[PDB]
Design a protein around this ligand. Structure first.
Ligand SMILES: CC\C=C/C=C/C=C\CCCCCCCCCC(=O)O
Ligand SMILES: [Cl-]
Length: 174
């Protein structure tokens, strides 16, 4: 039926770092194992003179089963040969927060309304993803317009993830 090989997934043709910069409100997320970013997630993308993309993220994060905190995260992106695929190094401004290095794919965007991101953290031996996450972002924290929503659904389906998202609240907790 559908091809769910990570290698088969389309990403944003000619991705434009500069156009993507600024403020992106996460509207929905598909969680990986051991989820971190919980809600109230707001991303701020930047590009420096050298053409390097970086970001910060603020939101409520899951520390222990028991509890969740407001945290500021930071990330920097290394280029690959595909201009929409990156390696993202990340850490928390607080030393004890999750840090790591994940693949960071801009699956689709129109720069001024919606973005779909995707990371496969671990492949299955059949090329399908064993452990993935995905954010759907909006420029407007009150949500996407219908045309954008519909494009986003199709991309979520193309990732083999359309059943597996939850909504992200923005209720001023942070
Ligand atoms: C893709 C993660 C959020 C969008 C990118 C935003 C900002 C640049 C990155 C800042 C640091 C990334 C924090 C990563 C933890 C992700 C997985 C999870 O929430 O469970
Ligand atoms: Cl493959």
């Amino acid at each position: 039926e559908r091809d769910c090989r990570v290698s088969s997934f389309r990403v944003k043709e000619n991705f434009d770092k500069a156009r993507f910069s600024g403020t992106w409100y996460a509207m929905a997320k598909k969680d990986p194992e051991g989820l971190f970013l919980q809600d109230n997630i707001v991303a701020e993308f930047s590009v420096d003179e050298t053409g390097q993309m970086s970001a910060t993220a603020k939101g409520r994060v899951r520390l222990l089963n028991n509890w969740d905190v407001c945290a500021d995260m930071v990330g920097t992106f290394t280029d690959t040969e595909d201009p929409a695929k990156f390696k993202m190094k990340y850490w928390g401004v607080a030393s004890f927060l999750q840090k790591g290095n994940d693949d960071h794919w801009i699956v689709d965007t129109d720069y001024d309304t919606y973005a779909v991101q995707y990371s496969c953290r671990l492949l299955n031996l059949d090329g399908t993803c064993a452990d993935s996450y995905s954010f759907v972002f909006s420029r407007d924290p009150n949500g996407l317009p219908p045309e954008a929503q519909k494009i986003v659904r199709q991309r979520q389906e193309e990732l083999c993830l359309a059943r597996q998202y939850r909504l992200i609240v923005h209720n001023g907790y942070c």
